[PDB]
Amino acid sequence: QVVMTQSPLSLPVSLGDQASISCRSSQSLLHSNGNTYLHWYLQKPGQSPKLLIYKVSNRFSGVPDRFSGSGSGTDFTLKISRVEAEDLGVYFCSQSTHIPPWTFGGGTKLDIKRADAAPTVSIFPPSGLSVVCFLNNFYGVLNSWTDQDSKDSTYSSSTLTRHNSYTCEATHKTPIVKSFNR
Amino acid sequence: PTVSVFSMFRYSNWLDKLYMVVGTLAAIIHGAGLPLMMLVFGEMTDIFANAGNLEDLMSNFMNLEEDMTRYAYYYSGIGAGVLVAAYIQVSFWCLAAGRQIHKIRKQFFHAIMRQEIGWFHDGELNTRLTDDVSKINEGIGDKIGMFFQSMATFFTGFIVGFTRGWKLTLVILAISPVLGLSAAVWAKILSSFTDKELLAYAKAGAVAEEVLAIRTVIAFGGQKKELERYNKNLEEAKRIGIKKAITANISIGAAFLLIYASYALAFWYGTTLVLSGEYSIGQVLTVFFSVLIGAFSVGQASPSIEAFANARGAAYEIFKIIDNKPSIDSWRIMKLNLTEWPYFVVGVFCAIINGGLQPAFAIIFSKIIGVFTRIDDPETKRQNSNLFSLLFLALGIISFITFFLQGFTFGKAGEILTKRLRYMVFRSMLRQDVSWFDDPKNTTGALTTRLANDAAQVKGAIGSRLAVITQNIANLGTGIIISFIYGWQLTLLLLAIVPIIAIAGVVEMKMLSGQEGSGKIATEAIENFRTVVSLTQEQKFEHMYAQSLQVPYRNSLRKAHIFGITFSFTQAMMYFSYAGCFRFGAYLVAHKLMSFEDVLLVFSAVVFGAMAVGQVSSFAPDYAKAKISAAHIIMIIEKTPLIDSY
Amino acid sequence: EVQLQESGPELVKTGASVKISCKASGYSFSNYYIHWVKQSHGKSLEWIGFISCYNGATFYNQKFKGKATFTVDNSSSTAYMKFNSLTFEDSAVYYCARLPIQFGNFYPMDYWGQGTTVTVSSAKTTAPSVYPLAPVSVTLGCLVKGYFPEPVTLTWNSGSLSSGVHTFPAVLQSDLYTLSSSVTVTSSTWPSITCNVAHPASSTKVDKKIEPR
Ligand SMILES: COc1cc2c(cc1OC)CN(CCc1ccc(NC(=O)c3cccc4c(=O)c5cccc(OC)c5[nH]c34)cc1)CC2
Ligand SMILES: COc1cc2c(cc1OC)CN(CCc1ccc(NC(=O)c3cccc4c(=O)c5cccc(OC)c5[nH]c34)cc1)CC2
Ligand SMILES: COc1cc2c(cc1OC)CN(CCc1ccc(NC(=O)c3cccc4c(=O)c5cccc(OC)c5[nH]c34)cc1)CC2
Ligand SMILES: CC(C)CCC[C@@H](C)[C@H]1CC[C@H]2[C@@H]3CC=C4C[C@@H](O)CC[C@]4(C)[C@H]3CC[C@]12C
Ligand SMILES: CC(C)CCC[C@@H](C)[C@H]1CC[C@H]2[C@@H]3CC=C4C[C@@H](O)CC[C@]4(C)[C@H]3CC[C@]12C
Ligand SMILES: CC(C)CCC[C@@H](C)[C@H]1CC[C@H]2[C@@H]3CC=C4C[C@@H](O)CC[C@]4(C)[C@H]3CC[C@]12C
Ligand SMILES: CC(C)CCC[C@@H](C)[C@H]1CC[C@H]2[C@@H]3CC=C4C[C@@H](O)CC[C@]4(C)[C@H]3CC[C@]12C
Ligand SMILES: CC(C)CCC[C@@H](C)[C@H]1CC[C@H]2[C@@H]3CC=C4C[C@@H](O)CC[C@]4(C)[C@H]3CC[C@]12C
Ligand SMILES: CC(C)CCC[C@@H](C)[C@H]1CC[C@H]2[C@@H]3CC=C4C[C@@H](O)CC[C@]4(C)[C@H]3CC[C@]12C
Ligand SMILES: CC(C)CCC[C@@H](C)[C@H]1CC[C@H]2[C@@H]3CC=C4C[C@@H](O)CC[C@]4(C)[C@H]3CC[C@]12C
Ligand SMILES: CC(C)CCC[C@@H](C)[C@H]1CC[C@H]2[C@@H]3CC=C4C[C@@H](O)CC[C@]4(C)[C@H]3CC[C@]12C
Ligand SMILES: CC(C)CCC[C@@H](C)[C@H]1CC[C@H]2[C@@H]3CC=C4C[C@@H](O)CC[C@]4(C)[C@H]3CC[C@]12C
Ligand SMILES: CC(C)CCC[C@@H](C)[C@H]1CC[C@H]2[C@@H]3CC=C4C[C@@H](O)CC[C@]4(C)[C@H]3CC[C@]12C
Ligand SMILES: CC(C)CCC[C@@H](C)[C@H]1CC[C@H]2[C@@H]3CC=C4C[C@@H](O)CC[C@]4(C)[C@H]3CC[C@]12C
Ligand SMILES: CC(C)CCC[C@@H](C)[C@H]1CC[C@H]2[C@@H]3CC=C4C[C@@H](O)CC[C@]4(C)[C@H]3CC[C@]12C
């Protein structure tokens, strides 16, 4: 029942650069036969997860030399030398030493690193009550999140469904507040 | 000068034709039984391997016995079918051959008594009557069934291999030609072994019978001259025998090495395919065993064609004669070979090593299959399979070397002993007196057969016996010990059928090998043909011949059925051994008292150990006859004459 | 070319049962186990169990024992995973992977299926409610509320306005989905546009023009 912990849930990278994804196990993954059975798979949206690395460092047949694996014990690392456009996805690790329960890592999505940005936070009163907040282009509550756009690689909403003071705090890591009265 | 193919069965009626047709049908059915058995064996091996892999995976056999009941049923069904088919084939072909040979004998003697005085040509006619009909019998008898059974085995094995795994089937096809060629050479050497031993001595036998046919030699005092004349041809015969002991043994050792190298190559490629995930170990077993046994059988059935051609040749003259329309129309023994202890030591060592080759093969085979009945790292599995393939190749090399060495050493010791015994016997006979030569127990024929047979049979009570016993011990004793170490319950069960498996091997070797009154009337008629044709006793002599043939005819017609049933039962026992052994093995593996590796080890070391024991013991000569001939030779050597002429 | 083709996405009702498939091609089917894995949204993959493609022997995770059943059809060389008494916590993406029988757990899951999306919900078909959103550059947008099931092909000006649009993914709001859309256009074009929502499952087409407050 090994609990595999992937250190970076999200990892922003850039084209033609090195990326490193870490994996930590709650128990030593070295087998009695001297081998460590940790494998790295890549999963793209809507496609089957593809085996990249197996047994810590061995490259699967067909995988380019871009991908390398290292580590031992309870600390492993997958390294991509030059992040190409065909490498964006979810990289997850998997152990096979301690079964029946095959366990997998949480996964690591590769975001594309660009310049920092600030959201264009706007609000809208109802036109059934429902106040919406649109936080576009940044780097009873119900939230949704868009994916990284292909053009500028930027994220973009909230909905609350009395009191006249209705505000929305946008405490980004770069706070912004927008207010409106009925 | 041979007769037509469809002219040799001219004396076969509707019953003989039906016998031949049903016999070849049953022979095809019997030949198609071993590849089907290998298919079932591969499926059962796959069951065992999958169960073992799943058990090794879920560490931290519930359907095995139920699944093995079905395969025991399949084994038993194939065994009963093989029983029936082999009985039908053997019995029917034997019956057809016997009836046709009876008719041929009667017609030949009828025509011989019908010839003219100007026709009556030699000796030669008697030898024709007693040997050409036996040649026809050997040619039109069980050997046609052998040929059809082996053709069926070859075709069925290759069809099974191609339908089960065509890549491995092609890989073993690439070596099938040399396998069939080695099997054919093996069969030819085994079939023409005694005839060549007679041909080697045929030169010295003429000098022996000419000198012994003796008063002139005693009077003129040329005993030393004739002794050296005999000793020269004895040297020649000994040289020819040593050359044969080299050649036959190196050929059969090359055949053994080829078998084991085929094992090595086929298992290396099959383990590659299994580790790649394309094949299963049971599929590999099925393909390999089917194709290999078929390729061996297709070469094993090569002396049948030679026997058929010899039958045509022998029947040509007989049919010409019977179609002639004449004008008129009316410690003490071992000491004898004590000077060959350097040969005997090497022979015993090589026989020990050769006998120990079967348990070593059992161990290596069980280990290479048990590699795939457990789960492990891919690299570890590949390394183990490579090591065991190399071990198969080493087994083959050691088999070649030790087989050739044992054969050559024992054959050279036997040839030296035979030459020495013949020389001393001829010297003591030349030293004897006319009072000894007049004794009607000392006939010229009896003395010549003492020189030709007894002197050549004494080695059967020393080297042959010692080699056979040593090999059979080093094989079966070590196999039984290892099987008791690894799985004593399965060993105790298989010990009950060990004797039947050894007897099956013996009976099958004798079956592949093919192992008085009427002759007297015939030779008297041929010798006194002038007086017979004067007294017009042709029809009466025909009657006496036909009445003297009746008891041998009935004996042959009964021995047909007897040998058919015993051969079929001994063949079906080899099939029932699978069912019994692997049913008990399924029980013991499900109850965790043993593993499939140890089951395979016990099987291969006990069942096939006993089969090899039987195959080897089929070559052992008669020990009682050998000791009687040794006593005869010793008394003639130690006989001292009264009127000494030396 | 090893391929493990899985069935399409399936939307079922709560408490019912459903059987998903994984058809293998390009290799010896009977030499591998087929493992089943479950991935919920925002969660790591979780191993359900495996079946032997040789005879059909199964092993289940102790959590899923009883509510999942593995079967195999060696003729068509397919594996099947059947649920029993489905529930909301069963809505996830289910993958099939192959594992060599010769090296169990000593060898990775080399090939996987593309995944089968199973959405379990008891709600019935509903009509989407469209609500414009205008302020008190100009940002506008019409929100879709209380529709079922997926999807709704929202569009701005029937495709003639495809730049500066942000259609956020639909999120479940008490057995009914909610979707939003944003459009930022220069201050000259508004209030001097129309959003079209199309729900094919209910066969609804609603066109709404944004009007200033
Ligand atoms: C009819 O021909 C022959 C007759 C004889 C001999 C050789 C012949 O032919 C070469 C050797 N004489 C001397 C005693 C003697 C010494 C050693 C052996 N041990 C062997 O392993 C052997 C040796 C020769 C041939 C074979 C096989 O063919 C053979 C075939 C299948 C299976 C076998 O074992 C598993 C075989 N084993 C042998 C046998 C016997 C006895 C008479
Ligand atoms: C380790 O694995 C394996 C090992 C082995 C085998 C298979 C394996 O794996 C599948 C096959 N064995 C196979 C042995 C093997 C070879 C050849 C034969 N032919 C004959 O006897 C034979 C055939 C035809 C005509 C005649 C005769 O006119 C004849 C006349 C007189 C005396 C004879 O003899 C005593 C005669 N004999 C024959 C039998 C048996 C070898 C070892
Ligand atoms: C129903 O079974 C059988 C029926 C018959 C025979 C053999 C059978 O069993 C294989 C022999 N036939 C006549 C041709 C003939 C002669 C000899 C052989 N020599 C061998 O195969 C063999 C030799 C030595 C060692 C071993 C093994 O350590 C061994 C271990 C596991 C499995 C095996 O084989 C499936 C093994 N084999 C052998 C084959 C064929 C007549 C009927
Ligand atoms: C397994 C099956 C197919 C075998 C069938 C074999 C049949 C066709 C054979 C086997 C023994 C044969 C019998 C043997 C002897 C005789 C005596 C003879 O004066 C007339 C024919 C007759 C009565 C034969 C008839 C056909 C027969 C019964
Ligand atoms: C005289 C008679 C027995 C000759 C005919 C031989 C027959 C019975 C043999 C020859 C080839 C054999 C087939 C070879 C391969 C396979 C595929 C396997 O997955 C099932 C059995 C099956 C389908 C075999 C059935 C039996 C078979 C058809
Ligand atoms: C002399 C012979 C014909 C007697 C009868 C033998 C019968 C019972 C045997 C011979 C070959 C056997 C077959 C060999 C192989 C297989 C494939 C396996 O996956 C299922 C069983 C099956 C299909 C066997 C069924 C039983 C079978 C047909
Ligand atoms: C003529 C002599 C030397 C050889 C006779 C047998 C030949 C035709 C056989 C024996 C081994 C066979 C090869 C065995 C395995 C493979 C791999 C497969 O993916 C393609 C076919 C291929 C490459 C086969 C081609 C045909 C082959 C070379
Ligand atoms: C000279 C006679 C007696 C024997 C000839 C044996 C030949 C045909 C055998 C021996 C070794 C065999 C090769 C062994 C391994 C491989 C690799 C595999 O991926 C394709 C087939 C291939 C390339 C085989 C082809 C056939 C082969 C070359
Ligand atoms: C069947 C007859 C005609 C020929 C057999 C000889 C050839 C084809 C076989 C016999 C033993 C075999 C070898 C056994 C073991 C090994 C070690 C492994 O790490 C690589 C392959 C290699 C080196 C095999 C190559 C093929 C081989 C050399
Ligand atoms: C000749 C008689 C008296 C005894 C014969 C003993 C034989 C069968 C025994 C003795 C020692 C054994 C070997 C001991 C160890 C190994 C290493 C293992 O990884 C493969 C088997 C192998 C190579 C064994 C093969 C069988 C073997 C050679
Ligand atoms: C586990 C141990 C005790 C097993 C010992 C097995 C012994 C007793 C067996 C194995 C091989 C056997 C021999 C095999 C062949 C022959 C030739 C025959 O013409 C006389 C018996 C004789 C000479 C047998 C005697 C008994 C024998 C030596
Ligand atoms: C050569 C023979 C006669 C030696 C004597 C043993 C023979 C008779 C065989 C036949 C049946 C066999 C038994 C069959 C089943 C079992 C149950 C198992 O859990 C232990 C072994 C045991 C008890 C076997 C012992 C050996 C046994 C008794
Ligand atoms: C329990 C142990 C000792 C094994 C049992 C002994 C077996 C293998 C022995 C005991 C008696 C032996 C038989 C004794 C005599 C002959 C006649 C000979 O022309 C061929 C071998 C043959 C047929 C032997 C075969 C092997 C044999 C059956
Ligand atoms: C009398 C002649 C023809 C045969 C003598 C041996 C017979 C009776 C023996 C040999 C092997 C035996 C089989 C071995 C194993 C099993 C499996 C078991 O679950 C049911 C009985 C069954 C199927 C046996 C039936 C009887 C059997 C076929
Ligand atoms: C008589 C001997 C020499 C040959 C035939 C052996 C046969 C009859 C033997 C060998 C193994 C045996 C089986 C071994 C174990 C069990 C389990 C037990 O709970 C019921 C009987 C059963 C199923 C036996 C039935 C008989 C059996 C199949």
Coordinates of N, CA and C in Angstrom, one line a residue, chain A residues 31 33 37 39 41 43 46-51 54-55 60-61 92 96-97 99-102 104-106 122-130 132 134 136-137 142-146 149 156-157 159 161 180-181, chain C residues 4 35 37 39 43-47 50 59 61 95 99 104-115 131-136 139-141 143 145 166-173 178 180-184:
Chain A
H31 N 13.4 -3.7 -4.4 CA 12.9 -5.1 -4.2 C 14.0 -6.0 -3.7
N33 N 15.2 -8.6 -5.0 CA 16.0 -9.0 -6.1 C 17.0 -7.9 -6.6
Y37 N 11.3 -1.0 -9.1 CA 10.2 -1.0 -10.1 C 9.4 0.3 -10.0
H39 N 8.0 3.3 -12.6 CA 7.8 3.6 -14.1 C 7.2 5.0 -14.2
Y41 N 4.9 7.3 -16.9 CA 4.0 7.4 -18.0 C 3.6 8.8 -18.3
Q43 N 0.5 11.0 -20.2 CA -0.9 10.9 -20.6 C -1.3 12.3 -21.2
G46 N -7.5 12.7 -23.7 CA -8.2 11.9 -24.7 C -7.5 10.7 -25.3
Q47 N -6.2 10.6 -24.9 CA -5.4 9.5 -25.5 C -4.9 8.6 -24.4
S48 N -4.4 7.4 -24.8 CA -4.0 6.4 -23.8 C -2.6 6.8 -23.2
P49 N -2.5 6.6 -21.9 CA -1.2 6.9 -21.3 C -0.1 6.1 -21.9
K50 N 1.0 6.7 -22.3 CA 2.1 6.1 -22.9 C 3.3 5.9 -22.0
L51 N 3.8 4.7 -22.0 CA 4.9 4.4 -21.1 C 6.2 5.1 -21.6
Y54 N 10.8 2.8 -17.5 CA 10.4 1.7 -16.6 C 11.7 1.3 -15.8
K55 N 11.5 0.8 -14.6 CA 12.6 0.4 -13.7 C 13.6 1.6 -13.5
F60 N 11.8 3.3 -22.7 CA 10.9 2.4 -23.4 C 11.3 2.4 -24.9
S61 N 11.0 1.4 -25.6 CA 11.3 1.3 -27.1 C 10.5 2.4 -27.8
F92 N 2.8 10.9 -14.9 CA 2.6 10.2 -13.6 C 3.5 9.0 -13.4
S96 N 5.6 -0.8 -8.9 CA 5.2 -2.2 -9.0 C 5.9 -3.1 -8.0
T97 N 6.7 -2.5 -7.0 CA 7.4 -3.4 -6.1 C 6.4 -4.0 -5.1
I99 N 2.8 -4.9 -4.3 CA 1.5 -5.1 -4.8 C 0.9 -6.2 -3.9
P100 N -0.4 -6.6 -4.0 CA -1.5 -6.4 -4.9 C -1.9 -4.9 -5.3
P101 N -2.0 -4.0 -4.4 CA -2.5 -2.6 -4.8 C -1.4 -1.9 -5.6
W102 N -1.5 -2.0 -6.9 CA -0.8 -1.1 -7.8 C -1.2 0.4 -7.5
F104 N -0.3 4.7 -8.1 CA 0.2 5.6 -9.1 C 0.4 7.0 -8.4
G105 N 1.2 7.8 -9.0 CA 1.4 9.2 -8.6 C 0.2 10.1 -8.9
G106 N 0.2 11.2 -8.3 CA -0.9 12.2 -8.5 C -0.9 12.8 -9.9
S122 N -14.1 41.4 -13.8 CA -15.3 42.1 -14.0 C -16.4 41.4 -13.3
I123 N -17.5 42.1 -13.0 CA -18.7 41.6 -12.3 C -19.9 41.9 -13.1
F124 N -21.0 41.1 -12.8 CA -22.3 41.3 -13.5 C -23.4 41.0 -12.5
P125 N -24.3 41.9 -12.3 CA -25.5 41.6 -11.5 C -26.5 40.7 -12.2
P126 N -27.4 40.1 -11.5 CA -28.3 39.2 -12.2 C -29.2 40.0 -13.2
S127 N -29.7 39.3 -14.2 CA -30.5 39.9 -15.2 C -31.9 39.4 -15.1
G128 N -34.7 34.3 -9.8 CA -33.4 33.6 -9.7 C -32.3 34.5 -9.6
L129 N -31.5 34.4 -8.5 CA -30.4 35.3 -8.2 C -29.1 34.6 -8.6
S130 N -28.1 35.3 -9.2 CA -26.9 34.8 -9.6 C -25.9 35.9 -10.0
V132 N -22.1 36.8 -11.2 CA -21.0 36.2 -11.8 C -19.8 37.1 -11.7
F134 N -16.0 37.4 -13.7 CA -15.2 37.0 -14.8 C -13.8 37.5 -14.6
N136 N -10.5 37.2 -16.3 CA -9.9 36.8 -17.6 C -8.4 37.2 -17.7
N137 N -7.7 36.3 -18.3 CA -6.3 36.5 -18.6 C -5.4 36.8 -17.4
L142 N -19.6 28.7 -6.7 CA -19.3 27.7 -7.7 C -18.3 28.3 -8.7
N143 N -17.2 27.6 -8.8 CA -16.1 28.1 -9.6 C -15.8 27.2 -10.8
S144 N -15.4 27.8 -11.9 CA -14.9 27.1 -13.1 C -13.6 27.7 -13.6
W145 N -12.8 26.9 -14.2 CA -11.5 27.3 -14.7 C -11.3 26.8 -16.1
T146 N -10.9 27.8 -17.0 CA -10.5 27.4 -18.4 C -9.1 26.9 -18.4
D149 N -4.8 28.7 -22.8 CA -5.2 29.0 -24.2 C -3.9 28.8 -25.1
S156 N -8.2 31.9 -17.5 CA -9.3 32.8 -17.4 C -10.3 32.4 -16.4
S157 N -13.7 31.7 -13.8 CA -14.9 32.4 -13.5 C -15.6 31.9 -12.2
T159 N -19.3 32.1 -9.6 CA -20.8 32.4 -9.6 C -21.3 32.1 -8.1
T161 N -24.8 32.1 -6.0 CA -26.3 32.0 -6.2 C -26.9 31.6 -4.8
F180 N -20.5 46.3 -6.9 CA -21.7 46.7 -7.6 C -22.9 46.7 -6.7
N181 N -23.8 47.7 -6.9 CA -25.0 47.8 -6.1 C -26.2 47.7 -6.9
Chain C
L4 N -5.2 -1.1 -27.6 CA -6.3 -1.5 -26.7 C -7.4 -0.4 -26.8
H35 N -5.5 -5.2 -16.6 CA -5.8 -4.4 -15.4 C -6.7 -3.3 -15.7
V37 N -8.2 0.5 -14.3 CA -7.8 1.6 -13.4 C -8.9 2.6 -13.5
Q39 N -9.9 6.7 -12.7 CA -9.4 8.1 -12.5 C -10.6 9.0 -12.3
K43 N -8.0 13.6 -9.1 CA -7.6 12.5 -8.2 C -6.6 11.6 -9.0
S44 N -5.7 10.9 -8.2 CA -4.7 10.0 -8.8 C -5.4 8.7 -9.2
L45 N -4.8 8.0 -10.1 CA -5.3 6.8 -10.6 C -5.4 5.7 -9.5
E46 N -6.4 4.8 -9.6 CA -6.6 3.8 -8.6 C -6.9 2.5 -9.2
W47 N -6.1 1.5 -8.7 CA -6.2 0.1 -9.3 C -7.4 -0.6 -8.8
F50 N -7.5 -7.0 -11.8 CA -7.1 -7.5 -13.1 C -7.8 -8.8 -13.4
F59 N -8.8 -10.9 -10.0 CA -8.4 -10.4 -8.7 C -8.9 -9.0 -8.6
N61 N -9.4 -5.3 -6.2 CA -9.1 -4.5 -5.0 C -10.2 -4.6 -4.0
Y95 N -9.6 3.1 -17.4 CA -8.6 2.7 -18.3 C -8.4 1.2 -18.2
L99 N -0.6 -6.5 -19.0 CA 0.6 -6.8 -18.2 C 1.0 -8.2 -18.6
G104 N 4.9 -10.8 -13.7 CA 3.9 -10.0 -13.0 C 4.5 -9.1 -12.0
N105 N 4.1 -7.8 -12.1 CA 4.6 -6.7 -11.2 C 6.1 -6.5 -11.3
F106 N 6.8 -7.3 -12.1 CA 8.2 -7.1 -12.4 C 8.3 -6.5 -13.8
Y107 N 7.3 -5.8 -14.3 CA 7.3 -5.3 -15.6 C 6.2 -4.3 -15.7
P108 N 6.3 -3.1 -16.3 CA 5.3 -2.1 -16.3 C 4.1 -2.5 -17.1
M109 N 3.1 -1.6 -17.0 CA 1.9 -1.7 -17.8 C 2.2 -1.0 -19.1
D110 N 2.8 -1.7 -20.1 CA 3.4 -1.1 -21.3 C 2.3 -0.4 -22.2
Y111 N 1.1 -1.0 -22.3 CA 0.1 -0.4 -23.2 C -1.2 -0.2 -22.5
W112 N -1.8 0.9 -22.7 CA -3.1 1.3 -22.0 C -4.2 1.6 -23.1
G113 N -5.4 1.5 -22.6 CA -6.5 2.0 -23.4 C -6.7 3.5 -23.3
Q114 N -7.4 4.0 -24.3 CA -7.6 5.5 -24.3 C -8.6 6.0 -23.3
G115 N -9.3 5.1 -22.6 CA -10.2 5.6 -21.5 C -11.6 5.6 -21.9
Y131 N -29.3 33.3 -19.7 CA -29.4 34.5 -19.0 C -28.3 35.5 -19.4
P132 N -28.6 36.6 -20.1 CA -27.5 37.5 -20.5 C -26.9 38.2 -19.2
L133 N -25.7 38.7 -19.5 CA -24.9 39.4 -18.5 C -24.1 40.5 -19.1
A134 N -24.5 41.7 -18.8 CA -24.0 43.0 -19.3 C -23.6 43.9 -18.1
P135 N -22.7 44.8 -18.2 CA -22.2 45.6 -17.1 C -23.3 46.6 -16.6
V136 N -23.0 47.2 -15.5 CA -24.0 48.1 -14.9 C -24.2 49.4 -15.8
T139 N -17.0 44.0 -21.6 CA -17.1 42.6 -21.4 C -18.5 42.2 -21.2
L140 N -19.0 41.1 -22.0 CA -20.3 40.6 -21.9 C -20.3 39.1 -21.9
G141 N -21.5 38.5 -21.6 CA -21.6 37.1 -21.7 C -22.9 36.5 -21.2
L143 N -24.9 33.3 -19.7 CA -24.7 32.1 -18.9 C -25.9 31.1 -19.1
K145 N -27.8 27.8 -17.5 CA -28.1 27.3 -16.2 C -29.1 26.2 -16.3
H166 N -14.2 33.3 -24.3 CA -13.7 32.3 -23.2 C -14.9 31.5 -22.7
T167 N -15.1 30.3 -23.3 CA -16.2 29.5 -22.9 C -15.7 28.5 -21.8
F168 N -16.0 28.9 -20.5 CA -15.6 28.0 -19.4 C -16.3 26.7 -19.4
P169 N -15.7 25.6 -19.0 CA -16.3 24.3 -19.0 C -17.5 24.2 -18.0
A170 N -18.4 23.4 -18.4 CA -19.6 23.2 -17.6 C -19.3 22.5 -16.3
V171 N -19.9 22.9 -15.2 CA -19.7 22.3 -13.9 C -21.1 21.9 -13.3
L172 N -21.1 20.8 -12.6 CA -22.3 20.3 -12.1 C -22.8 21.1 -10.9
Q173 N -24.1 21.5 -10.9 CA -24.7 22.3 -9.9 C -26.0 21.6 -9.5
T178 N -24.0 23.8 -15.3 CA -24.0 25.3 -15.5 C -22.7 25.6 -16.3
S180 N -20.7 29.0 -18.6 CA -20.6 30.4 -18.8 C -19.7 30.7 -20.0
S181 N -19.9 31.9 -20.5 CA -19.1 32.4 -21.7 C -18.8 33.9 -21.5
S182 N -17.6 34.3 -22.0 CA -17.2 35.6 -21.9 C -16.8 36.1 -23.2
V183 N -17.0 37.4 -23.5 CA -16.6 38.1 -24.7 C -16.2 39.5 -24.4
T184 N -14.9 39.9 -24.8 CA -14.4 41.2 -24.5 C -14.2 41.9 -25.9

